[PDB]
Design a protein around this ligand. Structure first.
Ligand SMILES: CC(C)(COP(=O)(O)OP(=O)(O)OC[C@H]1O[C@@H](n2cnc3c(N)ncnc32)[C@H](O)[C@@H]1OP(=O)(O)O)[C@@H](O)C(=O)NCCC(=O)NCCS
Ligand SMILES: CC(=O)NCCc1ccc(O)c(O)c1
Length: 210
């Protein structure tokens, strides 16, 4: 028995405490790198909260057992000056993750897929407590966002997945692949950076039109 609720500003510390226990340790990229203490990822996770479309799953004791942090994403302006997120990151391990994100964006622009859309919902951080996995919480978190999308005329939900394992969860929820890149093919300076276990494969960007 759990609720799905909007994450409030006062929830920031509790959200971070939960992510530090789970996501920071068990997202496949974070585990591969042994991310450790990472204030940059705390900052990254807190950023979308004021967009008022991030959700927490909360158990009967009032503990956060899952989150899906989402932010609105806008089509680059005609006069856009594109920036690399990695350039302002001092944490060397998190810089590798941000560099991977920058690389994906250099190769693939979600706004090219949907030329008529100005605003898209971006699913940024998805994490469920281990003891509550396999119960459909990820799906219930995701589907709460559809409510927000309906209320605001947003058609597209975009979610970059860090493993085929989580891309499959999104597929079950009605998302489809829009871009993929194998870890074995990600060689920004000529050499492989990420080498997690074979079943992870690589990143897949997933999208749903609601
Ligand atoms: C990805 C994640 C959020 C999924 O959350 P979830 O609420 O467990 O999602 P689901 O209930 O749909 O379960 C997904 C699959 O996990 C498997 N599963 C079943 N029981 C499980 C358990 N006790 N523990 C882990 N996985 C389990 C099943 O394959 C299940 O699919 P199915 O129920 O359709 O057969 C969760 O695994 C997680 O936090 N992973 C680590 C962080 C991460 O990778 N986040 C996503 C980044 S894109
Ligand atoms: C939908 C989702 O949770 N995507 C995760 C992408 C990501 C973000 C930050 C990290 O540190 C990381 O390993 C992976």
């Amino acid at each position: 028995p759990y609720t799905i609720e909007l994450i409030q500003p006062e929830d920031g510390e509790a959200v971070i405490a939960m992510l530090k226990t789970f996501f920071f340790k068990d997202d496949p990229l974070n585990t591969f790198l042994d991310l450790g203490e990472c204030k940059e990822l705390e900052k990254y996770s807190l950023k979308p909260l004021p967009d008022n479309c991030s959700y927490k799953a909360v158990n009967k004791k009032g503990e956060i057992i899952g989150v899906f942090l989402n932010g609105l994403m806008r089509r680059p302006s005609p006069d856009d000056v594109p920036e690399k997120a990695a350039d302002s990151c001092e944490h060397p391990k998190f810089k590798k993750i941000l560099s991977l994100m920058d690389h994906v964006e250099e190769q693939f622009n979600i706004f090219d897929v949907y030329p008529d859309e100005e605003l898209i919902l971006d699913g940024k951080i998805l994490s469920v407590d281990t003891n509550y996995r396999g119960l459909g919480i990820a799906g219930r978190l995701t589907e709460r966002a559809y409510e927000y999308m309906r209320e605001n005329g947003i058609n597209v939900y975009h979610v970059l997945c860090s493993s085929h394992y989580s891309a499959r969860v999104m597929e079950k929820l009605g998302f489809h692949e829009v871009f993929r890149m194998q870890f074995a093919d990600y060689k920004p300076q000529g050499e492989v950076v990420f080498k997690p276990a074979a079943p992870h494969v690589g990143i897949q960007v997933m999208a749903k039109e609601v």
